[PDB]
Amino acid sequence: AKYTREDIEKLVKEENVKYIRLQFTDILGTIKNVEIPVSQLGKALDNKVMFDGSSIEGFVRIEESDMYLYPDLNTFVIFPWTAEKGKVARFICDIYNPDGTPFEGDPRNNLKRILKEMEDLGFSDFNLGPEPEFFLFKLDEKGEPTLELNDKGGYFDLAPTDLGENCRRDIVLELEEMGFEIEASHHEVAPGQHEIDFKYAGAVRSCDDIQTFKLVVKTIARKHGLHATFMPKPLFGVNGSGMHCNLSLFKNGVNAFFDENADLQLSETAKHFIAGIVKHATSFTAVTNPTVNSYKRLVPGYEAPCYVAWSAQNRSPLIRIPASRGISTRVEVRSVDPAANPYLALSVLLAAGLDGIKNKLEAPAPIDRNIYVMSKEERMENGIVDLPATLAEALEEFKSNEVMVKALGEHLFEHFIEAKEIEWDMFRTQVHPWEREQYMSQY
Amino acid sequence: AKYTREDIEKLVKEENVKYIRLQFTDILGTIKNVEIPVSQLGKALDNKVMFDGSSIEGFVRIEESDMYLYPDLNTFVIFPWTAEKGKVARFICDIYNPDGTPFEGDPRNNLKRILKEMEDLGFSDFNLGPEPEFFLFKLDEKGEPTLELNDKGGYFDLAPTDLGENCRRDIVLELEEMGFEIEASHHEVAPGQHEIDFKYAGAVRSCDDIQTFKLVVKTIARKHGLHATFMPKPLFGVNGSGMHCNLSLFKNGVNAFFDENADLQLSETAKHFIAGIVKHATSFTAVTNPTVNSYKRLVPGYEAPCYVAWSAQNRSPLIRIPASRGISTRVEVRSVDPAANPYLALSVLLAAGLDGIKNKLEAPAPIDRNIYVMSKEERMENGIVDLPATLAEALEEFKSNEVMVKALGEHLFEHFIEAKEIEWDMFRTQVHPWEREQYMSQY
Amino acid sequence: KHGLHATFMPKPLFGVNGSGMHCNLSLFKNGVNAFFDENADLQLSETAKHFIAGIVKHATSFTAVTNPTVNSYKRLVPGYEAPCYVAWSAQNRSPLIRIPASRGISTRVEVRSVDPAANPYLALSVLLAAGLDGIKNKLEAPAPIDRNIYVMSKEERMENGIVDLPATLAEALEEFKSNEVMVKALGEHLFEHFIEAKEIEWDMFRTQVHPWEREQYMSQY
Ligand SMILES: [Mg+2]
Ligand SMILES: [Mg+2]
Ligand SMILES: [Mg+2]
């Protein structure tokens, strides 16, 4: 435990906290919350604070149902930018049913369940090193989003010189004050695109920071007159944004993926992991790329995964394996994007991985040769399947996979499919300007 | 023969024709042409006029290849609106290879081939009574299309009162002077939507008029400061435009679909026809609804076919059977839209129909009960398949059907698939404003 | 002060959720929640049952007070989690009366028809009146209607103990004028002026010609 209930009570008093937000996540990955005055902390730490848990299902909810809110004192943070008049602190919580049992529809819960499957397999911890990317746009007069990019930097360039702005720097500084240990940041390929990578951390913790990260990024960015977005592909023709996930399984406190003696220094356990993700990849894409626009990023020519395959060095493998070895040995899934629900994304990935480990699934041969120059036919002969091209396709596949479906839970699954299904329908029944610019006069 | 070569030469001289357009259609249904001075008529009637036939493949062409142009004197027409300075006449032609043989890539040819399959089956003629719908929009200052509709009329209302405009009336009048025998016209369901129905006519002739019709509509409409469009679904939320096709097979000069003694007065031949279209419907949709936007019209709630089924009276059956019987006995396919290539659409329909007749395919039971209130599950139990939801799906199905594929010709098929395939890719890799209005801020 | 404008208007925007001011009620006898009952169906004492009966009886009658404005009824429309029919449940799309999960001294009856435009004191007067009317007369509470009312035909909906709330301010006012206890719940002087205020108010709204009317009739006719 990082914070005992006394440590908190003393922290709220000393730091003069005046506002406490009890945040959590819904099925769509959206960051939700229920704010209480500092004079409510007591009932909060007592887990007696209630709320309409049907809000977890998002815009699919049908009837309100009372649910409890159990704060996790380890996630206690104090937002530094808020000050004077009143300091604001948060508390990521766990949703609990009125009777006292965990709500099966809560994503953060689903992750723990899958993580419990991992421990029952002999594994200690499951780390995650995310690489969330995002774009920053300018705000107009009314303070609305615009297609105007904040800068014109390239991949790894000295983005926004150290002026009074440099939103990317400022975010990293704010995160550091909040206790966020960041690895490094840099300007991304496309103009106005940025990236900040964290140090590895346990599953639930890493996902907790991904949620808090987006919040901080969007917040600080709005203070700088900018608008931050984790939309997979905002602008056509330019690079999209992904949130690559470096995973590593630990056993007895040792990277179970490292095998110095083995070729590429990758142990049998690690190779089976790969097989797992390779077998379920096309099936968990609906989760790791939950939006319609997510698939506008999954197109060739922008360094984003399009076919299921892995290597050490390639134009853009679905699964990449970093150079560093030893305790850093890890497998990187590059298909995931920042729009994905961090908790639901790990749940599915871990399940795909743990699947191969248990069933000793055999991993295919790496693909180091350029795969983007091969035809769909030539791709088959080599056993290279393609990822789903649309949310619709990703949904049919996801429903075909028994393990991936069980990786979310009957409740969560049911709602996820319902929401996305409606999402797609709206999109498909819609008539976009492109269709008019292309057919209005031609026909 | 309607016009002997002498009749033409005398008509061009007497009517002082100064400009002759040798029109034809490409694979995309687009109306193409090659205009010649009246002083070129000779070489024209001699079928010695050449052109780059690779233009028939549309934006897919790769290398130019000389091809001949054989005018059909029966299609000779004189556009009435053009006058004074110089009168203009047209001549729908047939594309012929340099050696003298018909080009397999010409749609109008494909239709004759399929029609030859019909005659070799004992049938005399194959009629077609189209019902093309279209919208008229206003032109701005620069004379560009706008989303502003010409009127606000409803279904069968007294559209645009008899003023100096009334574009719908004026088109019908112009067509009548050109020798177009129209059945009737009326204002359609959606505002600014119009419909004009012709009298039945042979396959090639009816398709010839559908091509000429669009030309006349778009032309006259532009004279009235309006902009005509046969785009399947211009505006979201409002009705789309279809081009229902009333078909009827003739044998020895008698409607082979009529059987007074038989129930519903429909002969065995007619019922087998239905079976044919019901079996290939999901497969020929890629042809009858060739554009991406075509599927934005194939959505429920706008009186447009969404499931394969037929009846005498329903909310919107794929196949409808008009009341009138006897020589008028006919089957109406309501899935087809005006964006479809008239020639390629008949080719496929006729093949689907002739398929059932030859193989004596058994027709399913009519569906008179409301089908739009049933679930996808409840739909299955009743054996009601759904039409393709996107151009992508329609293409995979079309390629699965051996008969439908052979209904177009190896050459035409190959090019059609290539073009549409590219069409879809552009559309899918595109990032529409809708996606941004929905994700930009949410993520 | 924030360059903004707060509004408690029941329904300021069409096709968007309206604002309601749900009222969680709870009666105490001798400093003890008279609505809680350890060993009882759904852990709800008789007094609580009777209170629910009293509200269900005068629900259609006190609507005029809890929804005093004309706009208050553009909120009372299906599809926006706002009460549209008289019924009490614990888990439903949008019941008029709801009984939250928690029990003990937290046992309460929630009335969701009330909106923020209502006069707090007057709203409580009729609500409490109706609730006491049920306890004093030990009115029998109807069966809790779970299921889903927002899909039942109107006939069917009526075949069961389910009536829809007043459609307009006028409809509500007439009903209110026929309910003796509801009338005696405000007071001769309050009731008088209230009815006057709303009738004069409603009349203004009924004689007005809205843009919607011209958009729909100016050309079609
Ligand atoms: Mg990157
Ligand atoms: Mg990376
Ligand atoms: Mg019509």
Ligand SMILES: [Mg+2]
């Ligand atoms: Mg019709």
Ligand SMILES: [Mg+2]
């Ligand atoms: Mg409430």
